[PDB]
Every structure is written in structure tokens, then in C-alpha cells.
Amino acid sequence: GDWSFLGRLLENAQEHSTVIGKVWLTVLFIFRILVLGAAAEEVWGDEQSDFTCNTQQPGCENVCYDRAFPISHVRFWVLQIIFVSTPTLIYLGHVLHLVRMEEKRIAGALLRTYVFNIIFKTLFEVGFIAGQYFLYGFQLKPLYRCDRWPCPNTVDCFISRPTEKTIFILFMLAVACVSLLLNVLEIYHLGW
Amino acid sequence: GDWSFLGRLLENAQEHSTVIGKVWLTVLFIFRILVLGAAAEEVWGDEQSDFTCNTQQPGCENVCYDRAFPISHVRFWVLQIIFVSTPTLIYLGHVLHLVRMEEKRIAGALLRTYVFNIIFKTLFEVGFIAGQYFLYGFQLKPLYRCDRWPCPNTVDCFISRPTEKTIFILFMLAVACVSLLLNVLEIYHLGW
Amino acid sequence: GDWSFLGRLLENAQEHSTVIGKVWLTVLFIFRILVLGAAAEEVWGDEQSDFTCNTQQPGCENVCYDRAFPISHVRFWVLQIIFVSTPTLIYLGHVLHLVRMEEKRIAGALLRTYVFNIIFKTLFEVGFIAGQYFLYGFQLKPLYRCDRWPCPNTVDCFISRPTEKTIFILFMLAVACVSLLLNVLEIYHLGW
Amino acid sequence: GDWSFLGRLLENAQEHSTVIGKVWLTVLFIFRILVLGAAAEEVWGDEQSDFTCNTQQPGCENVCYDRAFPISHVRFWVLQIIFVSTPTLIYLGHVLHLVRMEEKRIAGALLRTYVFNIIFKTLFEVGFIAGQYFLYGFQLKPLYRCDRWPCPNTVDCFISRPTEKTIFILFMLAVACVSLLLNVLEIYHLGW
Amino acid sequence: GDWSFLGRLLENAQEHSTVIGKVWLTVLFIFRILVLGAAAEEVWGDEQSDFTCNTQQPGCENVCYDRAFPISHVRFWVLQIIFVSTPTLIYLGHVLHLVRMEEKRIAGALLRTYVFNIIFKTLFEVGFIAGQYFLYGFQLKPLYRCDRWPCPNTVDCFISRPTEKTIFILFMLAVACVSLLLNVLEIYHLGW
Amino acid sequence: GDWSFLGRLLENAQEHSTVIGKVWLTVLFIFRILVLGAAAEEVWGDEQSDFTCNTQQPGCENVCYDRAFPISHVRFWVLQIIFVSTPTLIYLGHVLHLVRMEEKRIAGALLRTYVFNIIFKTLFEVGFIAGQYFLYGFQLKPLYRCDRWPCPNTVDCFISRPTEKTIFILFMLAVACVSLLLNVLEIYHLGW
């Protein structure tokens, strides 16, 4: 996917943000967007094509893949990025609104807005972490037993590249925990 | 697809627009164009290839896929984006026309033009929502029973990635409702 | 395909053109080039691969696809865009020629050149419309009966995505009619 | 392929060139490079994959495709573009050499260099035309009879998309003839 | 993958860095990023598709490929690049922090930060080298014998393009050793 | 692959280089990088997929392709480009080092550095030529007889697009000879 438009706005936010905010944006670009574009999209490229089920039943592989992977991980992480970035866009918009107001004519209202930004980022991060955990856990096993109609009885289905996907799942989990740490540290730094 | 040309014009409109207009444009880029380019096009990439029908009849899969999906959702959303953006282009063109006139030599005629922009955006949005609803509803079921010639009697056909497509259908529906809310809020803000 | 080079020249023409010329260029970019790059190329991506004929004869599918689609629609529209844009390039070149002449040292010769531009645009548009109509009409039916050697007797061949292709055929036809209307309106505006 | 680097140099040549030279460069970009990138590469995309021969012999399709198409047309046209553009690069380099000389410190030596540019362009154009003609003529027939080892006796092989390829072959031939006409006209204009 | 964002930051670091730092960045771009984008990604493109195992057992190829290649080499090198580049980002951020401080109002704290940068680069490099070595060694043999369930007894599996992958493995190993040498030389140059 | 980063540095070298150096860089971009990106990568795109061997033995095609093509030609040429360009990067770095030194505060040390650049370019060119020659010669024959285990006895394997690959092999050989000639001419020009 093409992230150029998002990147320009985020950089604008970087100018009007704290040092730890700059660190968070750098982590976002280098360790989430770049890793997706360069590494992870390829890992999940053949998710359905190489998914194989031991049966002669038409349509069992499709329904079993759908049940095994209701949403693909990469799409989940795309949404995650977009939602953790949106609050920064809100804050940047408020900043530019006040700057344009001054033209017409961090403290105060902007400070409350920055705090709300931090809070929403933290909450969306925790939410996507918990969601991923409940959907899959943090380990994709090679065997998926499926009993979804039209499949007769239970069929064995085999996931492609399970170990590599587990590695990247844990990598992205770690990145999200790091970003949570950065947000908490930013709250501490501003408050005290 | 490449949206660079559309993006430059929309940003130009953003400079000569209200704060809520800037919010609407941001939603358009981040939550429609970026989601399509990064997430949804991949979901619908294997729509026909992985579409499977339980038959030995040549040409049944093609006709059944065509009847099940007269237009693909992603193409529908492309059209939707283009049409909800066109009124902004009209307003921006009127603005630049008046600015070039001044060079030669929001209120008044520009205000009526802005209102017409809002109205057309709202109407096109509602229209595409209702169209999607009547074509598919908001849930793609895995099984599609097809009785279209050359298919003999009724055949079972299985859609690929139905759950993920349902998720994104509802995501885009929500985004469109949000944009409707923004347009209504803009009318309220300007009027009162 | 990459249209960046064409786009820069057309924008240059936009600066030295009438308001309706700017509208025509906007329609060209948004409703022809962008629709092709984002929507239509995908629709026609699997034209030959998913084309299926009910036979065991080697080479029948190739010859039957070739007879059914002598040129693909997308290529036709590419040519159409290029040819309707060329007159604008002629006019822009004449403009820059006269401007460079002035440096060395709309009315008059430039006006006749602009009229010729309009006329050639209209004629090429009508020509491509009539050509598309005689090749295919405006409806692609799912069944194509083919009797071309090596095919034995007549064979049934099934087109992929016929409904979506019909939808886009009619969309592009409508866009071309709109552009004809714009050209006629421009002639009226300049003349009177 | 990516032609950005070539394009910048050619535009530089356009600044230091005659009006007819600007026309020739415009034709080169719009009617050769753009047509290849947007239309023709897709037509020849499935040249070997959809090439089919009526046999059960391993390796007959490969050798027969190789004999039928020693070089692909698109590659021929790439080479053609590069070679007809190289003389312009020579002339531009001579121009910049003399300009840098002046900094240190069309007529004369530059005029002879421009004439040599025109001559080499014309000769390379004629050469590529004649080469294409002797390789294929200007019509690709659907049936290719092949008797190359390992093929047993003569086998029937069927080319993919023959009519569309013939159409584009003739289109590019016409463009090259137009460019020859432009070069001859430029010689006439400069001489008299 | 798209490395544009990383590249801009690294170039910024290049301005505020030693000559040997500039050499290291040049090696990073030319001999790691460019080689991946232009050469290696293609070599590993068909890693799983062309992976073949001599069996009729469903799912044996998937599990055997996963065990043979827990992570793909290209992804390993992507991570390696990102991690060896991160310390440079830290140092550049500290530099810009101090420059913005001066605006508000190599030696000292910046020198210690530069040393820490060098140390982390060296350690991450050694770590990725040792990791690659323990995973695969420096030679990919064509035959991989696999006894992972569901595979019955031990099955023979054949890797695609083993010699070319060995060549590139050794190329990247050499590049990493060169970069280690550069870091050690930089420590020597700064210290003495 | 993406060569933008390499291109910017090489152009920088072009500013601080001789006329023949500018010719060499132009040849590098137009007749090596552009030909690869636009023509050759497509020719070698289906190298392994269309490689066919006359056998029923699992894994024979993989090992036979690996032995026939230890490295692919395109990758060889990528490496060749990178290595013949590296000396120019060295010289440019030395130039910028001295210019930054002057800021702090072709002849002499820069002249020796330029000569070393020329020498390394010539040696790397000769080395890659001889390497290609010993690996393949300058002709790829269609038939490759292979006796590598697991293949039973000797098997016949058929290369895809052998004639076109021979054509491009000879084209690139000619380009490299031309570049050698340019380097020798540059040595002569500087010396005398």
C-alpha cells in the first residue's frame, strides 16, 4: 500500500511535538510501516493460495481459511497504525487551527488536547493488542482442524509459513509494547 | 491505483475550506483511499480465482461469479470516492475562477456554491450507501447458490474470504456514516 | 501505466485555457485516467486467463478470444485519451512558441488554433465512440459462440466479468458524451 | 520499466532544440513510451504462457516460441527508443560542453552536430523499421507451424492475442514513419 | 519494499557524521538496500512455490518448508538493516535536540552518544551474523530431508535456486564484515 | 529494483567529472540500468517457471536449473553496475571531503584518485566480462543435458527464451566493451 499522504501529515505533527513524540513517530515509520511494506506483506502474500486442506470436498478450503483467519494479521496492523495515528492528526489539526487563528488576528487547551491524544493512542494500542490475542494468541500452529460445512466431519488444514508469521506477530507485539512505554513515559515527562 | 493527481486538487480545496471540511478530507484520504490501497485491494485480489463452484460444467463459475458480484465492492468504493470528491473540485474551481478574476481586475456566491457542494456530497453518499445495501446488504455469506445457464439445475458456489470482506464492508459503511455526520455538522455550523 | 509525463503537459495547457477547458481536463484526469488506473485495469486483468471455451481442442481458446476481443477495451480507451489530448498539446506548443517569440523580441491566430483544437477533440471523441459501438456495442454478453479454425463446428466460450465490464463501458461512454457536451459549450461560449 | 532518467535528459534537449524537435520529443514520450507503459506491455505480458502447441512433447513449446519470436516486439521498441534518443543526448552534451566552456571563459559546430543528430535518428529509425519487417512483417498470424527439435515432424502452435499485437505493430510503424517525416521536415526547415 | 522514509533520515545523519560514517551509510544503501531491491528479492521470490517434496502427503511441503526456513533470509536482512540503522537515528535525534535547544536559547555528550551508536551497530551486526550462521550456516544445500508430521517417515525436499542463494548469503556476509571493519576503524580514528 | 539513490550520487559525480566521464555515466544509465528495468528483467522473469526437463523425477528440474544457472545473468549485471559505480562514489566522496575542508578553512591528490577510479572501473569491467564468459560463454543453447542427483541417468532440459537472452547477453557485452573504450580514452585524454 501507499502511505505517502499519511507520512506527510505525521511529519508535520513531528515538528509540533515533544522529543518522545518524535521517537514514537520514528518507531511508527521504521518498525511498523517499513516492516510491513518490506517484510510482512510478502510473508502473508500466499496465505490462502498455499493454505491446504486434506480433502476432496469443493469449498472446504475457502470456508476453513475464512474461519481460521477471519481478518488477516497485516490488515489488522494496517488498521492499528491508522487508528493510533489518528489522534496525532487531531492534535495537529487543532494546532494549525490556532495558528491560522493567530494569523487572522504547548500549554492551555493544546495541553489538554495533547493529553487526550496520548490517552486515545494508549487505549487503541491496548485494544488492538487484546483483540489480536483473543483472535489468535501469539502463536500460529501449523495444523488447523476444521469442521465447517461443507467440510465432511473434521478435516486437517495446514497453514503456510507458520513460524515466520509467529516471529513477526511477536515482533509487532513488542513494538506495540514499546510504543505504550513511550506514551506512559511522555505522560510522566509532561506531568512531572 | 494511483491517486496522486486527485490528492493535489483535494489539498488545494483543503486550504480554501472550513475546519470540518479539512476533517472530511482527512477522513477521505486516511480512512478510504489509504485503506483501499493498503488493505482492501488485497482482500479482493483473489475474488474470482478462489471463487469455486461444485460442478464439472464449463463456464458455470464465470456466470455465477458475475451474477453474485455484478460490480466488485472495491470498484464501487472507487466510484464513491470520485463522486463525493467531485463537488469539492467544483467549489475549488469556482474559488480559483474568482481569484483569477480579482487578479485580472466565504460569502455570497461562494457560500451558495459551498452549500451545493455539501448537498451533492451528502446525496451521493446516501446513494452509494443504499446501492451497496440493495446489491449485497452488509454481509457476504460463504455459500452462493446459482442457477444461471450453463449451470445445470442449482450449483453451490463458495466465496473467498467472506468474513474479512464483511468486516471491511462494515468499516467503509461506518466511514461513510461518519462523513455524512460531518457534512450535517458543517451545515449546522455555517447556518448557525 | 505511468501517465506522469502527459499530466505535466496537460496541466500546462490548463493554465493557458478557458474555464471549460479546465473542467474538461479535470474530467479527463479524474474520470478517465484515474478510473482506468484504479478500477478498470483490474476488471480486464484476467480477460484471457479466465476466458473459457467448452472444448478439448488445442488453440481454440486463443483464436476465439482474439476474434471476440480484437483489441481490449482498456487499450482502446488509452488510445482515446492520448488522441483527445494531443490537440491540447498542439495548442500549448503554439502558445509557448509565441511566448518564446515575444521573449526573443486568446485572440488572432491562437483563437483559430484553439478552435481547431476543439474540433479535433470532438471528432476524435465521436470516432472512438462509433468505433467502440461497431466493435462491441455497449453490452458484453456472457456467451460467445465461436467457429474459428482450429475450433471444430461452433464452440461455446464464456467471458469473465461481463456485467462489470458492461458497467464500465457505459460509464466511459457517459464520460465521453459529457466531454462532447463540454466542447460544444466551449464553442458556444467563445463564439457568443 | 522506469524511464524517468531518460526523460529528464530529453526535456533538457527540448529546451535547446527547434520547434520540430519539441514535436518529435512529444511524439516520443506520448506515442511511444506512454503507449508501451500503458498499453503494449500488457498485450505482450502473456506471450509465452498463453502460447500453446498441439503436442505432448516436452520442450517443444519453448523452442517453437523462441523460433517464432527471437526477440519480443516490446523489447525491440525499447531498443529503438533508446537508440533514436541517443543522438539527442550527444547533441545536448555538446551544447552543455560549450556552455560550460563559456562559463569558464544554433550555428557553427553546433549546427553540424544537430545535422548529425538528425541523420543518425533517421538512419536508426529506418534500420529498426526494416529489421522489424524482415523478422515478422507487419502481421502476426495466429498459426505458427514449427519443426524444431525436439518437436516431432511439424507441430501447430497458436499465438496469443494476434490481432491486438498486429494493431499495435501498425500503430508503432505509423509513429515511426511520422517521426521520419518530422526529421525530414526539420532538415528542410533548417536548410531553407 | 519502500525505503524512502528511512533514507531521508539516514542522509540527515550523513550530514552530521564522520567521513567513515558517510562510507558506512553509502555501503548500507548501495550494497544492502539496493542489492535486496534489485537482486535478492527476486531470488527468494519463488522460495515456497518452487519448493518441492517427494511425497503424496497433503501438508508435508508446508511444514517442511517452515522447518527448513523458519524465517526467510531476505526478511532477516531487512531486520538487520533496520536495527543497524536505528542507533544512527538515535544519534541524529540527539543532535537535532541540541540544535533546537540552541535555537531556543562532535564533542562532549554528543561524543559519548556517537560512541554508543558505534557500539550498538557493532553488536547488532555481530548478533545478526551469528544468528544467520546458527540458523543456516553459509551454504544452502539442495536436498532437505524432513521428518515433520504429517510427513510419513523422512521425505526428500528440494530447495529452489540454492547456488544463487548461497552466493548472495556470502555477499551479504562480506558486506557485514566490511561494515564491522568500518566501525572499528571509526573507533580508532576518533580515539586516536 | 529501485535505483534512485544510486542515481543521485552518480549525477553528483557527473558534475565533478570530465566530459568522457559524463559520457560513461550516460551510457551506464541509459544502456545498462534502463535496459535492465525496461527489457531484460522481463526476459528473465520466467527463467525457472518455464524451464522444463523431460522426466517424472521430483526435484530434477530444480537441481538442473541451479546447475545450469548458478547465478542469473540479470543479477550478475546488477552486481557489475554496482561495482563499476563504486569507484566513482569513492572519488566523489574524496572531492566532497576536500570541499568541506576548504569550507572549514582536478589536480594533485584528486588526480591520483581519479586515475585509481579509472583503473578500478576497468579492472572490475574486465573481471565481470571474463566471469560471464567462463560461466556461460556468449550463447545460451536451448538444450541443457543434466546428470545431477536426483535425476536418473542424463535428462534433457529446455531453457526458456534462449535466443532473446543471447541477444541481450551480446548487447550488454558490447556496452561493457564500449565503457572500457571510454575509460582507456579518458586515460589517454588526461595523460596527453
Swiss-Prot record, chains A, B, C, D, E, F:
Entry keyword annotation includes Coiled coil: no
Keywords carried by this UniProt record: Cell junction, Cell membrane, Disulfide bond, Gap junction, Membrane, Phosphoprotein, Transmembrane, Transmembrane helix
Transmembrane intervals: 19-39, 71-91, 118-138, 167-187
Record-level GO BP terms: cell-cell signaling; gap junction-mediated intercellular transport; visual perception
Post-translational modification: Phosphorylated on multiple threonine and serine residues. Phosphorylation may have a role in assembling connexins into connexons and gap junctional plaques, as well as channel gating.
Superkingdom of origin organism: Eukaryota
Topological region Extracellular: 40-70, 139-166
UniProt-annotated location(s): Cell membrane; Cell junction, Gap junction
Annotated disulfide bonds: C53-C157, C60-C151, C64-C146
GO cellular component: connexin complex; plasma membrane
Residues in the Cytoplasmic compartment per record: 15-18
Intramembrane bits: 1-14
Role noted for this protein: Structural component of lens fiber gap junctions. Gap junctions are dodecameric channels that connect the cytoplasm of adjoining cells. They are formed by the docking of two hexameric hemichannels, one from each cell membrane. Small molecules and ions diffuse from one cell to a neighboring cell via the central pore.
Subunit structure, interactors included: A hemichannel or connexon is composed of a hexamer of connexins. A functional gap junction is formed by the apposition of two hemichannels. Forms heteromeric channels with GJA8.
Recorded family membership: Belongs to the connexin family. Alpha-type (group II) subfamily.
Name of protein: Gap junction alpha-3 protein
Organism: Ovis aries
Lineage, broadest ranks: Eukaryota, Metazoa, Chordata, Craniata, Vertebrata
